[PDB]
Amino acid sequence: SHNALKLRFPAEDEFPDLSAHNNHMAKVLTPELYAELRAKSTPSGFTLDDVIQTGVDNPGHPYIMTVGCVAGDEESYEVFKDLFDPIIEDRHGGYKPSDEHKTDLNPDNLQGGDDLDPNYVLSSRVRTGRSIRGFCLPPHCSRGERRAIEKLAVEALSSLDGDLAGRYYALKSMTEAEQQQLIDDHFLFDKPVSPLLLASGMARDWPDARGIWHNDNKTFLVWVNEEDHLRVISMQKGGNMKEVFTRFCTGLTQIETLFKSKDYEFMWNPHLGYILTCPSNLGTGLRAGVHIKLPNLGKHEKFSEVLKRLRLQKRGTGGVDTAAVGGVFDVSNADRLGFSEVELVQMVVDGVKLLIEMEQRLEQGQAIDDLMPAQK
Amino acid sequence: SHNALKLRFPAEDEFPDLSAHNNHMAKVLTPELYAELRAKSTPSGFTLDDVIQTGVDNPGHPYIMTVGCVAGDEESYEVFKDLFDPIIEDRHGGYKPSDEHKTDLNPDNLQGGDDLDPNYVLSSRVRTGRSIRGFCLPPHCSRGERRAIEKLAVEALSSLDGDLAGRYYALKSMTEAEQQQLIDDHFLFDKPVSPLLLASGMARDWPDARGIWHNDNKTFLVWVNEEDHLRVISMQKGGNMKEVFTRFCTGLTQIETLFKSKDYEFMWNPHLGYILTCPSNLGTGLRAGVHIKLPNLGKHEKFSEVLKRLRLQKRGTGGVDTAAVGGVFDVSNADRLGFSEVELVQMVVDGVKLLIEMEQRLEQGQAIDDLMPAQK
Ligand SMILES: Nc1ncnc2c1ncn2[C@@H]1O[C@H](COP(=O)(O)OP(=O)(O)O)[C@@H](O)[C@H]1O
Numbered sequence: 001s002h003n004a005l006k007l008r009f010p011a012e013d014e015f016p017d018l019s020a021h022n023n024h025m026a027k028v029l030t031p032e033l034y035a036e037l038r039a040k041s042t043p044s045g046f047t048l049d050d051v052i053q054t055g056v057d058n059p060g061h062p063y064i065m066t067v068g069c070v071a072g073d074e075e076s077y078e079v080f081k082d083l084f085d086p087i088i089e090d091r092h093g094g095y096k097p098s099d100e101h102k103t104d105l106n107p108d109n110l111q112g113g114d115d116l117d118p119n120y121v122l123s124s125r126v127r128t129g130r131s132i133r134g135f136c137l138p139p140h141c142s143r144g145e146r147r148a149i150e151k152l153a154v155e156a157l158s159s160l161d162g163d164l165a166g167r168y169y170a171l172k173s174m175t176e177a178e179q180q181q182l183i184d185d186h187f188l189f190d191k192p193v194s195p196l197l198l199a200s201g202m203a204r205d206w207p208d209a210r211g212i213w214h215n216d217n218k219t220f221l222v223w224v225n226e227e228d229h230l231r232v233i234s235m236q237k238g239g240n241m242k243e244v245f246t247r248f249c250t251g252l253t254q255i256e257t258l259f260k261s262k263d264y265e266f267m268w269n270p271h272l273g274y275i276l277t278c279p280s281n282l283g284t285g286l287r288a289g290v291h292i293k294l295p296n297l298g299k300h301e302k303f304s305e306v307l308k309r310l311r312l313q314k315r316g317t318g319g320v321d322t323a324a325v326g327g328v329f330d331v332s333n334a335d336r337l338g339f340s341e342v343e344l345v346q347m348v349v350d351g352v353k354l355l356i357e358m359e360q361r362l363e364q365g366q367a368i369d370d371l372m373p374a375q376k
Numbered sequence: 377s378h379n380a381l382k383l384r385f386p387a388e389d390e391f392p393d394l395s396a397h398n399n400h401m402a403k404v405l406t407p408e409l410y411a412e413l414r415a416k417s418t419p420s421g422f423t424l425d426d427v428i429q430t431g432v433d434n435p436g437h438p439y440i441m442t443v444g445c446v447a448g449d450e451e452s453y454e455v456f457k458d459l460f461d462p463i464i465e466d467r468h469g470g471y472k473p474s475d476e477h478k479t480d481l482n483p484d485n486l487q488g489g490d491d492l493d494p495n496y497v498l499s500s501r502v503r504t505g506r507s508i509r510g511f512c513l514p515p516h517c518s519r520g521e522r523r524a525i526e527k528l529a530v531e532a533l534s535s536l537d538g539d540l541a542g543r544y545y546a547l548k549s550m551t552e553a554e555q556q557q558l559i560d561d562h563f564l565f566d567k568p569v570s571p572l573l574l575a576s577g578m579a580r581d582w583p584d585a586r587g588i589w590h591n592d593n594k595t596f597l598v599w600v601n602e603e604d605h606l607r608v609i610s611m612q613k614g615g616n617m618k619e620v621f622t623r624f625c626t627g628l629t630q631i632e633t634l635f636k637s638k639d640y641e642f643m644w645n646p647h648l649g650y651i652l653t654c655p656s657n658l659g660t661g662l663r664a665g666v667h668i669k670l671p672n673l674g675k676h677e678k679f680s681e682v683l684k685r686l687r688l689q690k691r692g693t694g695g696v697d698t699a700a701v702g703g704v705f706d707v708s709n710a711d712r713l714g715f716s717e718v719e720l721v722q723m724v725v726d727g728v729k730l731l732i733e734m735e736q737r738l739e740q741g742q743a744i745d746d747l748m749p750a751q752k
C-alpha cells in the first residue's frame with residue numbers, strides 16, 4: 001500500500017505547500033484537516049491525496065477561480081465531506097451541509113427566452129453531466145470501467161429516435177481533421193490539454209473508450225468518458241434558448257429512462273443533487289449560456305461585476321481554457337447547486353437581455369452614471 | 377399450512393398491488409385468476425405466491441418487460457398453467473398452449489456453419505440449461521436436493537474423457553488463483569446481484585453445492601446449481617460454429633447417458649421442451665452466438681433493424697477487442713421456444729454470413745440496401 005507508506009511520515013511532512021495557491025481547496029485544507037483525513041479511503045481506494053492533487057499542482061487558472069480537487073467515486077463526497085462541504089459552501093454561494101437541492105426539468109416553467117437578440121447571440125447551449133452509479137469517476141476509473149461505461153452509453157443512446165436519433169463516433173475512429181473540425185465547430189471536447197484533466201488523472205489511456213454521440217443536426221450531443229461519464233448537450237445557432245432547453249429536458253429524460261430500463265441509475269442524492277467529478281458541477285451540473293458578441297462590454301468598466309451581480313460567468317469562445325476572440329464571449333450561469341434547472345436558465349435569459357441593453361448603451365446615446373447606487 | 381393462514385383472508389386482501397408494475401406476471405394476474413389459483417400447490421408445496429414473488433418485488437420497466445415469475449419444480453408449469461401459458465405465449469411471440477416444441481440435437485442437420493469468416497468472427501459459442509427430473513428447481517430446492525444434484529453432476533462430468541476430459545471447481549473451496557484464472561477465462565459465476573434472481577430464493581445457502589467444471593481445452597464449460605441445475609456451454613475462437621455445436625450436442629448426450637445409467641433424466645415434455653426455472657428459457661433454452669467485428673455495420677442506422685429481421689439480437693462488449701476494432705458485438709439467436717436447436721443455430725449461421733456481406737460492402741463505401749433482408 002502506498003498510503004500506508006505515506007502514513008509512516010508525520011502528517012506535517014506530507015502536508016502540501018499551498019502558499020502561493022489560489023483555489024477553493026487551498027482556502028479550506030488545513031494541517032489539522034489533512035492529518036485527520038489522510039488515512040481514510042473510499043471502497044475503491046481513493047484517498048485525500050488523490051482528491052487534492054490537481055489543486056496542489058495548479059496554483060491557479062488564467063480565466064476562472066478553480067475548485068482544486070475532484071471526487072474519484074460517489075463515496076468520495078461522503079468520506080471526505082469535511083473537505084468538500086466547506087468548498088461546496090464557498091463555490092456555490094453559501095450552500096450549507098443541511099441544505100437541499102431541487103430539480104425542475106419542465107420547459108413550460110421558463111418564461112420567454114425564445115428569442116434572444118440574434119444580432120447579439122450567435123448560439124445557445126445547455127449542458128449537464130451525469131455519472132453512472134457503481135463506477136468510479138474519470139479521475140480514478142480503470143480502463144475496464146471506462147470501457148464498460150462506454151458500452152452502456154452506446155447501447156442506451158442507440159435507442160433514441162425521432163429528432164434525437166443519432167450515431168456514436170468513437171474518438172479513436174475519427175481522423176485528425178475530423179476531430180479538429182468538431183472541436184473548432186464547438187461540438188466536441190478538446191484534446192486532453194486542460195491542467196485539471198491532466199493533474200487529476202482524467203487523461204489516462206486517452207483516447208481509449210472516449211467518444212461523442214450526436215443526432216444528425218448536431219443539436220443534441222453526448223460526450224462519453226471525458227471529464228464525466230456523460231456530458232449531455234443541447235445547442236444550436238441563434239438565441240432561442242427556450243427551444244434549446246426543451247430539447248435538453250426531453251433528451252435528458254429519455255436517456256435516464258433508457259438507463260433505468262437496464263437497471264442502472266445516475267449518482268444522485270437529495271443534498272448534492274447529481275454527483276459529478278468536479279464539486280463545481282454538483283446539483284444540476286447545468287451550464288446554460290450563449291456565445292454573445294459584446295466588444296465594448298467586454299472592455300467596459302465593472303463588466304466583471306455586472307456578471308457577478310447576475311450570478312453569471314464568462315469564458316472564451318473556445319471554452320473555459322480559452323480567451324474571447326473577436327469580441328465573442330461565452331456567458332452562462334455560474335451557479336449549479338441550490339437552484340433548479342429552470343431557475344438557472346431563467347437567470348441566463350434575463351441576464352443576457354440586460355447585458356444586451358448594457359451593450360446598447362453607447363452606439364445610440366446613453367451610458368450608466370446617474371441612477372446606480374442607493375443599494376437597497 | 378402457512379398458505380392455509382392466508383386462505384383465511386379474502387383474496388383481495390392478499391392480492392399483490394401491481395399498479396406500477398411492468399412485467400409479464402403482472403399483465404396476466406387478474407384478481408380473478410389469483411383467487412382461483414392461490415389455494416393450489418405442487419407436490420413439493422410450491423404455491424402461486426411462491427411463483428409470483430419475484431414479479432411482485434420487481435416492477436420491471438415499461439420499455440423492458442421482465443417475466444416476473446418462476447417455476448419451483450417441474451409440476452409448477454402444470455399446476456399453474458393458467459398463469460404460465462399466457463406468459464409463455466406473450467413472451468415467445470404467440471407460442472400457443474397447444475403448440476409442440478421439436479428438439480433436434482443432431483449436428484448433421486446443420487447446413488454449413490463450419491467456416492464463418494475468421495476475419496470477422498472472433499469466437500463462437502452455444503449455451504443452454506438443463507434440469508434433472510425428480511428435483512425441485514433452484515428457487516425451491518433444499519440443501520439436500522442441491523447437494524444430490526451436485527454429486528450426480530460431478531460423477532457424470534468426471535466420466536467424460538478425451539476431448540471432454542476436465543476438472544471440477546467447487547465455489548466453496550475455490551482459491552484466489554483459481555477464481556482469477558476463471559475470471560480471466562470468463563468461466564466464473566458469483567452469487568447473483570440481480571434482485572430478479574435474489575427475490576426468487578434461488579441464492580439460498582450460497583455457495584453450498586455450487587460449482588464450475590470445464591474441460592482441459594477450455595472449449596466445454598458446465599455451471600452447477602446456479603440459475604438452473606445445469607448450464608452447459610460450448611465455445612472456441614474462430615467461426616467454426618458447426619464444431620462448437622457438435623461438441624455441445626456430444627457433451628449433452630454423454631452427460632444425459634451417464635445420468636440415465638443411474639435412472640435420472642432431464643425434465644422435458646413435447647410442449648415446453650426442456651424445463652427450466654424461467655419461462656423465458658423454455659424449449660431449447662439455447663443461445664448460440666458469435667463475438668464478431670462489425671465496425672462499419674455497427675454504426676449503420678439499419679443495424680438494429682437487420683438483426684431484428686434475421687431474428688437475432690446483439691450485446692455490445694467492453695473489452696480490448698471492441699476497443700481496437702471500434703465495434704465488436706455479441707450476436708445471437710433471439711428465439712428459444714418453437715424452434716429446434718438446429719434451426720436456431722442455422723439462423724445464426726445464415727444471419728452472420730449476411731452481416732459479414734454487409735460489412736464488406738460498407739468497407740468498400742457501398743450501400744447495403746440490396747442486401748437488406750425481409751423479416752423472417
Ligand atoms: N453558447 C455556446 N455556443 C456554442 N458553443 C459553445 C457555447 N458554450 C460553449 N461552447 C463550446 O463548448 C466548448 C467549451 O466547453 P466548456 O469547456 O466551456 O464546456 P463545459 O461547458 O464543458 O461543460 C468550446 O469548445 C465551445 O466551442
Ligand SMILES: [Mg+2]
Nearest residue numbers: 189227319320
Ligand atoms: Mg469541458
